[model samples]
Every structure is written in C-alpha cells, then in structure tokens.
Target chain A: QTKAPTAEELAAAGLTLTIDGEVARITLSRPHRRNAMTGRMWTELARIGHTLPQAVRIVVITGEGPTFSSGIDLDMFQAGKVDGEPTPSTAALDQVIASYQEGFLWLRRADIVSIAAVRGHAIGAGFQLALSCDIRILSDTAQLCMKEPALGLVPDLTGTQPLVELVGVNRAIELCLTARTIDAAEAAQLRLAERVVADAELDAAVDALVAQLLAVPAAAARATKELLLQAGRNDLATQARVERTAQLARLAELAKA
Target chain B: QTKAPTAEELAAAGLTLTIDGEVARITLSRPHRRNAMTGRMWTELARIGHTLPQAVRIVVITGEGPTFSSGIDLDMFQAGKVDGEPTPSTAALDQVIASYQEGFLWLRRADIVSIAAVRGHAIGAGFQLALSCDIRILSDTAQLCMKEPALGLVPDLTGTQPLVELVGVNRAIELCLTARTIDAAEAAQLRLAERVVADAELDAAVDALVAQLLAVPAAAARATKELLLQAGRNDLATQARVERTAQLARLAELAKA
Candidate 1:
C-alpha cells in the first residue's frame, strides 16, 4: 500500500505467465505504468507460488515496463475502490494481505529456486518485489531503493525482514531512512545481487540459469538446498540431523510412486 | 584440538598486541589445538572496548591455524583442571557456557568493530568463532558449514542470534540441516562475508580495513553503529528512543572519560 506504482503494461489479465521447458517465467505486462501491481495482480502472484506445478524447477519473475515495479499504484491508493476491488482496510483487507503475503513470501523459500530479473527502477514495492526471490540476477542499470518509510508507511509487501538481513541494520536503516537509490554495482557489493549482466542480456542470462537449474534432479536439488538454508538458524548438530532426515524422506519418496 | 593455534603466542602472558599507530591488533594465542581462551582473554578484549587507550580504533581477529577455533577448547569444557581451578560441576554447565561465552560474546558489541578472518575448516565450536566479529571477511577458498546439529548441538556461542538474524529462518535451517559447505563466492553472495578476497590477501585485506576503520572518530562511529545494530529488533518509536538513550549515555560518559 505504498509508492507510486506505474502499471503501464495493463494487459487484459494485468499479469502474464509462460512456461518454457522447466522454467516458469512471469512478466508484469503493464509497461506503460512501470509494471506497478494492483492488489488483483498481487493476488495472482501469490496464487502462482502456491499452485505452481512440481514439474517446474525454476521461476523467473520480471517486469515488462521500463522498471520492475513502482510499488502500489498512486492512483489506485487514491481510488480506494469500494466494491469487487482489492483495497486495503476494506472488508477484504485481511484476506487480501494474507493472499499477498503468500505470493511474496514463497520467493524467500529454497524449495523452488526463485530468480528476479530486475532492471530500471525497483523502488518501494518494487524493492519488495525483488526481495521475494532466493537468487537475484540484476541488470547493470537497475536502481533499487526502499521508498516506504518517507511516506509514513512500512514495508509489508513481504520484504522488510529479508531486506534488513541482506544489508545489516545500520546500512538497511540508512537506505530506508534516507530513501536513497542503490545502483546495481553497490547492490552486488552488498551481496544482494547474485549475478549482474548488461540490461540487454538480463532475460537471456535468466534463461541460461533456468536451463542449468532444470538440469538438476528436482528432489535432490530442492532437499539439499532446503537443508543448506536452515543451517544458519539452528546449531550444526541439529542441522546435520535435519539433513539426514530430509535425505531419508527424499530417498524413501524417490523409491516410491 | 583442531587447527594450528599457537600455544607459544598464548604463553606470552596469554596476550598479544600490535600497534601500527593506526590499528590495534590483539590475539588470544593459546594454540595447543584450537585457541583455548581464558577468562583473562575476555577481560583483555572487553577492557579494550571499555577504555581503548591507543589513538587507533579498529580491531580484527584471526587464528594462526587450520581453523578459527574448535570453540572453547575441550579442556575448557572439562571439570576441575587447574590446581586452584574452579572445579566446574554439573551445577556449573550453564555458568561455564556463560564464562566461555564471555570470551567470544564481546565480538558482537560494536564499539571498535571486529572481523573474523577465516580460512580452512571451521567445524563444531570452530564455526561460531566468527560470530563475535562485526563482519566476516572470508577467504575465497574457504568453506563454512554449521557442524553442530547432527550431535544434538545448538550453537550457544556468542553469535547464534546474530547469525539467525543475518541469513533468516529458512536458509538458516537449510545450512544447519544439510551441514553443507558454502564456498567462498557463495559465502560472499549470501551476505555472510563482507569481502571474499584471494586466500593470500585475506590477512592483508582485513588488516587494511582495520586501518580504514581506525580513521573514523571512535565515539561517533561506535554510537552511530550501536544505534543501527539494535534497530531491527525494536520497533520505530522504541528504536528512536533507544538511539536517544544511547546518545545521552555516551554524551555523559565521553565528557568524563
């Protein structure tokens, strides 16, 4: 519910998805408005994360406009629709926020490796937009800034916690309080960017990684990655037991139907 | 019991200090195996935080060995060793953990800034060794995995909370569950390493940072840093007050000290 999201690529569906081989690519088609998402679109994103088939190994999320996202559309916030609309603090606020959380929260998950192919301005919700992914492949020209605080808002599009973790508390605060832009190179230096290439090569780079990811056996890959992710939270002894437990389950399952 | 910790260095009154007129370097040199720290080592580290006598500011940590530390040495884990040795009994495990915690926990208190320069195998207690420092500057060739969980262990070291805060819930689970290796480039990507330099440059890079850190005014730098460190856990108004309270205390203390 923040930032001036520009949703120019306003297709009939407002969102589009195309699966190529084992990679599921999602594009925000509203190019004219910088691909700012409406609550309707946010709901769609969440549903995709939940309903995504086991056949897919990688998910590539990108924006079709000049930027990834501009956050919540300024116009929509003013509109504050009353009926059959995705409005905050409306009769549907709880369900809508929960649905949106489902959409964004899964990106931080290791179960399915998620990648964000970002370029242009990724601000506010757009920043949370990128934070959803487990791995981020940025375009050199991408500009990211958390623009919520200045607006007397908070980042609830499922991004605040991960953002803080990516950059330490001081740096994270400096970015939010100052609401400044972090260019691609600084993002990479902060270890926020897993890989960066020319803006022109962004989609292609994402596709190549998709190919690499698809080559792996899904069960082993996801289970192994899942274990590695939990390692930092629990102690090593617990971690190893978790690893063995996951492996055991996977082994048993793989042997069955 | 692991790595080339220098026992001789530990014997030099169990303390080592180097002043470059720019940065102060201290090492707990008890390398019979892993760096077996004494209560005195903690006192030395905390004393530096309490009253840094030198004009220099930055502090860095590294062990001369195959690992950072095997935790507090197994000897420190034992009961009733020294002649006047306080015989650690069943009633004392919690206290021993606390005492052992003293040696490493000071690393998180960001007054002068600390970094763990890690290379080689850091296992079991050795892995928590880096948690004490403010930043982790790992060697590009280094491999880190949480090695505690398999044995019903939890990383009760000085850094568990920070580590959990650094990576996040699920990824932290992954690391501990799998007990897998996070290689150099990957470590850097994960925000675990501030910088992943060539193995040869690891020491030089950390040393160089110590000089750079010392260039800032100690009080202002540390106060600003302390404010940032605690910002995430507390809410906005609370954190703002936290900043105010810290500033007030420091203002009064600096005037006298």
Candidate 2:
C-alpha cells in the first residue's frame, strides 16, 4: 500500500488533502496557473486514492481559485515533461496512459462517494476530472468542454465511459466532436451535473449535499452504490438478484443495529 | 420468423399497426381499458418486431386514448389468464417472463430507431414499454411511475436497465422505491424524455422528431446508434477503437458516394 503524502510532498504535487472525520477534501492548489494539472498532480491523485483513510466515506474535489482548472499545463506540451516525469516512448505509451488514468478511475471506488465541486472552466482534462466522480455539483459560472476530440484525440483518462453513461452516446459525441462549451444550465439538462447553483452558493450547495449523503448509513450506501454501478452491465434478472442480495445485507446490518 | 399479424389479429390484440413509407406506427387501441396490456399484446409486440418491414427506419409507439397506458390489465390477475394464455407455474415463470421481456427488448435493435410518444399515465408495464424505446417524447400530461415495487414486485420487464441508465442510481432508487409519479417537466430534468410538449402538441412534436430522425442517412444512423448503445459497456480505450473502426466504415461508404 502507498503511504499518504506529507504536507511538503502534497504542496510540491500542487494538491492539498485534508481528512476531517468521515470526509476528505482534495483541492487543486495551483491558483497561479488556474490550477492546471500536470504529471505530478496526476501522480499525487493516484497516491491519494491509494492512501485515503479507511474512515473517509466522502471525497470532495475542488480547485483553490475561481477557475476549476484550465486543463493540462501548457508547459508540459512545450517541455515534454512535467515534474521530472519524462514522456513515454511509443511502445510504452499505452501503459503510461493507463497509469495516468488511475488518477481519475479511483474516484468511482465503491467505498467512497466522490463529488466534484466545479466552477468556471473545466476544459479537457479538467472536465474529465469532474467526470471521474460519482456526482458533480457545479456553479452557474461553470463551463465544460471535451476539447480532446477537436485536438484529434479521443477522450482517454477514464472519462469516456462515465461521460457516455451520464449524457448518453448521442450528446457525448456532439459535445466531444464539437468541443463546444456547455454552461451549467445545459449541463443540468444533459444530466452532466447532479446539481447546479448560483456561483456564490456553490459551496453551500455542495455542503448541503455532502451532509445529506453522509446521513445514509455507510454500509448501506456502499452496498447500494456497488449495486447501482453494476446495474447497467447486468441484465434485469441479474440486477434483481444483486439488489436482493444488497437488501439482504442491509437488512442484516439494520437488524444488528 | 413470425409473420406480420393480420389486421384482424392486430385488433384482437388491442393494437393497430400502420406502415407508411419509412415509418411504422404502433398504437395501443383499447381506449376503454386505457390501453391496458395483456399477454396477447406482448405476443403481438414480439411478432411485430420479428416481422417489421425491412424498409422501415423509425417506429413510433403511442396509445389511442388520453392515457398512454394504465399498465397490465387487472383481468390477467383476476383470471390468472388473458387472451387464453395461462399464467405460468413458479417453475416456468422465469422463462415466461423472459419471453415477455422479448416484446420490449427488440425495440433496441440497431437497424431502426424506436420512439415512445407518451401522454397521461405510463405505469408499471406501460412505463417499461416506454422505456424500451430508443427515445421518448412526453406530453405535458405525462405521469410516469415505476409501480411494480409498490405492488411487492420488481420491474421484471426490460425497464430497470434503462431506468438506471437515464437517471443515476440514487434517483432511480428513490423513484422506484417510492412508486411516486413524475410529471413531464421532472421527466425532462431527469432526461427520461428527449422532448416534452403540451398535450395538444404531442403528435406534432413526435412528427417533427420523426422527420428529423428520418432525415439522417440510414446506414450512418444505424452504425452510430450501434456505437452509442455499446459505449456504456466498453472501456475508454475499447470504445475509442470501436469508434475508429466505425469511422473507417463511414469514411469508406462516403468515399463510395
């Protein structure tokens, strides 16, 4: 198992992690660059996932500044490396990309409910980081774009599955292909955001939701989430059995209580 | 393959099928019963799927009266039979339900698009039937409920997968567990409906959408739908490969043109 990063290590990686009771907050802290991500940030993210406290049930991801993120740090493109991590050769590219994807993929873990508190622009990798979460609560000022396709790339980084799942394939295609920006209202209509509020109210709204989410019993929440995550892949009969098993577990837990 | 039902057979099954050019319309015709479905109706539905004309590109499903459907006929429960088909014993119930689900499942075929033009109540099986379609257009009068759970039954038809797919698991759980009715506006917010219009404008809205759907080139539409449908099941890399292959086929066809 990976050890949690120390304060100095987190600062160097451009992130801050705070574990408070049952909740964890991960803040992208590079406000000077609109909190743009880099290889170090992704590496830190994966490390955080690996070392999250077992007691933490909710993980709220947010940026430190007005902008959620401006996506990839341009310096990485120019220098071909960020934070001392060199670009991979062609043969190793696939494995390297998979490693990067680990940063986003862990947000969907069954034990934790990940929420993206997004505002301003979430472009390219920024948008995907939000997509990685179980739910998103966006501020009215938030603007999202899937810029990869326009740049002659498909959305990798573990975003495509959840993107297609949330928005449906037709809308996903249009958004990714056009790489057009969608504001919070359209994002709500597209089911991209679980909730959207005025810019000023974003934090309070997220807090309110976090409180509500935490009110549910932890074991039940975890079981239900696991069931729902697999519901799409399972046929009706299989899902019914799965649900029954989950309910049974929940009932047994409640009986003990 | 089953042959298309004769007009008399369709009427006996409480349905009317009209084929005109590229579109086919299937209407539930038992207005007195609020278009309640029966075993015969499901049988006829599967038959229609099997025998639909190859030239048909769009299938529109609607009901004859103010209500889209009142769901399964009560007579089936009282008599333990409907249309001379006996209810299956517990041992055979699984297979019987599977056969019944076939009626709703085929609406998802990649070769054609299916739409539900729903007005008034769509309860239980009626809701499942609407869910079976590729898209739904709801009239302002629409009231949808997942009634099975309240009646001590799981929705055994093909509705569960699509329900969880459209709305996230949390919302799906709240809706089904409560058996609460949701109006058209809520449905729109939840993305249960692609479009919602006033009850008076339902047909026109559906017609407009049908025209737009038909305007797309057939092969492209088919291929795109297939791709979109499978996107949720595949990983990002896998879906990317699938997209490239599909784009290659599309490009080859365009080159031929």
Candidate 3:
C-alpha cells in the first residue's frame, strides 16, 4: 500500500526514475562509487516497482558513464551495519534480507517488459540486479561475475533462478564456485545476454528494443508474458488452455479497437 | 509400485538399457523401423528410467545406428489400432498419452543427468524425447523439427516448455507453426543442443561428456542438481534456505568420509 516514489526520493537513493508517455527509464547514477548499490537503494527500487505508473509499457534500466555497476558497496559488509544503519539480530536480519529481495523480484511482473542495458563491470549484486530484469542487452565491454561465493557469501538476492535458467546447472555451479568474470562474448555464448552492442551504443540499443516492445498492444504483451512466465511451471494441457484464453481476449479487444 | 524392467523385457521392446561402470545407456535399437517408437516401447522406456541402478550417475539415450529417431511409427496413428493393439476410447486415449509421457518425464529427475545423443532426424515425438533430457549432444547432420501442427495435433509430450525455454516463445511459435527443420548449427545457436560434433565424432564426444559428468561425486552431483531444478520454483529466500540445508548435508558427509 506504499505510494509511488517521488522523483526526489529516487534521486536520493542513487537512482532516477523518469516517465515519458508509455516508457519508463531507470538510471543508476552513482558513478563516483561505480554505481555500487546500498540498502537504501534496494528499498527505493522496490518502491518504484510496486508503485510504477500503470501506463508504462516498458522500463529500461541502465547505468550512467562507462560502467553498469561495480556491485554492492564494500561497506555493506561491515560488522553490525547495513548501508549506514545498525544491523539487527540474526532473526531480524533474515527478514531484512527478504525485504531487500523484493526490489529484484517485481521485474517478473507480466504487465511490463524490463530491460537491463549493461556495460563495463557488473559484478556481484550489480550482476544480480541486471538478472532481475526480463532481458539483458549488453555492451561488448560488459563483464559479469557472481563474486559472492568467493566473498564467503551466497547470492541471496533474486538472481539464482535466472542464472540457472540462462546457463545450465553445471555451468552455473562452475561459475558461482569459481567466481570468474565472463566477458560479453562469453555471456552471449552462455545465453546470458539477449543482444550485445558496442560499448558506446548500449543505451541506443536498449532504446530501440524498448520501441519494438512497445509496438505490441499493452494488454496483448502482458498476456503473452504471463503465458511465458507460467510455461515453466505448467503442463502442456494447462499452458494450452492459458494461451487459448489469452488469445481469445486479445482477439476480442482488437475487434473492438 | 512396479518392478524394474529386466534385460529380457527391454530387449522385447526393441530397446536396450545397459550399464557400464557409472554410466547407463539407453539405445533405441529398432534400426529397421528407424527407431520409430511404439506404445509398448514408451512403457519400457519409463520402466528403465524408474528402475535405473542407484550407482548410475549418468544416463545416455541414443539411437543404435545412423538416425536418432524418426518419431512415432506411422502405424500408431491408424484409425483403429496402434502397433497392432486396438485403439481405446477417446477418454482412454487421454490416459494413454499420460502414461507415455511418463517415459520422457523421468529424464528430468534430479538424481542423474540425462543426455540425449542425437543425430540425423529427430521429428515430432522423437525430438521431444531429446528435449526431455538435461543435455543434448548433436551430430553435425542433426535436424530437429516439431511436426505436430502439420500432422494436425499438438506437441502433447513434454517438449513444449523445453522448446520454448531453449528458444524464445516467438521462435518456438514459428518453428511449430511452420513445421520447419533446423539443422545442427541453428540448433546450437538456439541453445537446443549443448554441443555438436562431426558425424564420426558423436560417440567419442558423448563418451568425453560422460567422463566429465562422472568426475563429480554422486551425492554432490545429485544435490546440486536438486537445487537447480528447484531454483525456478522457489523464491530467493526459500532457495537460500534450500541451498544452505543441502550444503550442510554435503559438508557433513565430506567430514565423515
């Protein structure tokens, strides 16, 4: 029941959310720290997702300057502290992390197509943040690494499923365990990147994709996404019924339009 | 519960399930029929999956000779019979297909990694059998086609989700609707095949893969696989708990050993 984030609130959290007609753009603006995300930033992201404008058909998430992000701020791991605030006890810490995960979880909502425009270093939580989106369009210079295991931590963010789904189980295990940085070429080979472009053209590439995504009717696009999202969990008979029902609704709407 | 299939029983069904060390191989052996599967063969395949030896760490499904499989035997679609067995009522046919699906379904079990060694043609249900596996190793000449729509039926076997997953939904839609054949190169680009080799190198390639798979301890392999399979369904927090619990068990076993 939280209200949508004001432009000022988003800016205060090291990000910016701008809405123009049917498209929304989210920018990671903390280039001074290589866009490293803090706890307040995570909470702000969740706020934006939960209160997104209904008219928006697409959301493009990208970083300012050369890098997508350098990962979580190093200070996030200081004993007895998270983002500048005092850390709670073990029991409370679990709930706090769960709340943080909410920021990455909502990109799976069927109503809008979310794209991550990535370049340079996208490591640890930064990499996981990009994975939270429905599609990742990368610049040739992008470097992705799941560095948590090497830091004696698991990737507790919402990145695990998408990682496993993009790369198969064995490869994911190898990558996570080794904590290796994979360049854009290797990421494309592994199905992690939907498309790759020149480093300077990353933003333009994402904008073009956004236009293509917005060409479809919003309801139809949402319905289609909902079907694809559920396909992994459903049986053939069930998924067919879902597709049939969604198509019929779209057809009826088009006739009226 | 049903008893495990005996070697004699599998031989009667025109298939072979042979164990060699840690690898178990299942071969479609009816060369004269181009490995076109029959209903009883499907039943036998399910039996082999269910009754696999506990020591087996990898399962390989391949054809005996040149072509991987030619899909369901044409005779199976006759007006009143399938493989000389009388066709049952429409209501009974639902149950029949469900039973047949059991054969492909078991390939996804977490305890063992299943590899489909495919060459030549894998059409309709034949392609589906390959999709059921966790990995597909293809010969240079491999051609995979989803011919169900042209044949006036849906792909009811467990292939839909995997096909949609490997290739995006739009590509999957085009493939199924047009009933087009994609060669080994395209299949690799689409992520359908894990690896492709020259026709003469297929067997050796599969053997190398089996060796790599067997290098991991069975318990750890199974545990990692279980986590991967469950990853898609569980939320981040739940999956974290799953990973922690599984890691603890593995650590305890390693300490004991």
Candidate with more favorable, higher lDDT: 1 or 2: 2
| Off by more than 4 A, model 2 | A78-81, A87-91, B1-160, B168-184, B193-257
The number of the candidate with the highest lDDT is: 2
Q: Write the residue-wise lDDT of candidate 3 on B1-257 in tens digits.
A: 26888877777777988899778999998888889888878878888888777888788999988888899888887766554455437788889899889999998887778889998999999999998888889999999999989999899889998787677789999999999999999998888887899999999999887776665566766666677777867755577666556645554565476
A69-185 per-residue lDDT for model 2 (tens digits): 998887866747676676445658777777788899899888888889998999999999998988888999999999988778788877888788787789988999899999999
Where does the lowest 10-residue lDDT sum fall in candidate 3 chain B?
B79-88
Against the true structure, what is every candidate's RMSD? 10.3, 8.4, 7.6
Could you tell which candidate, 2 or 3, scores higher by DockQ?
3
User: Residues B1-257, candidate 2, lDDT per residue (tens digit)?
Assistant: 56789889989889999999999999999999999998889878989998999999899999998999999888865637676677433325455665677788789898989999999999989998998899999999999987764544456566777889889664565466446789998999898999999999999999999889888999999999999987876899999999999999999999999
**DockQ numbers for every candidate?**
0.06, 0.10, 0.11
Relative to the true structure, candidate 2 reaches a TM of 0.60
Which model is ahead, 1 or 2, in terms of TM-score?
A: 2
For candidate 3, give the docking quality class from DockQ: incorrect
- The TM-score obtained by model 1 is 0.55
TM-score of every model versus the real structure: 0.55, 0.60, 0.63
- Misplaced by over 4 Å in model 1 are A1-10, A80-92, A251-257, B1-257
* Residue A185 displacement (Å), model 3: 3.6
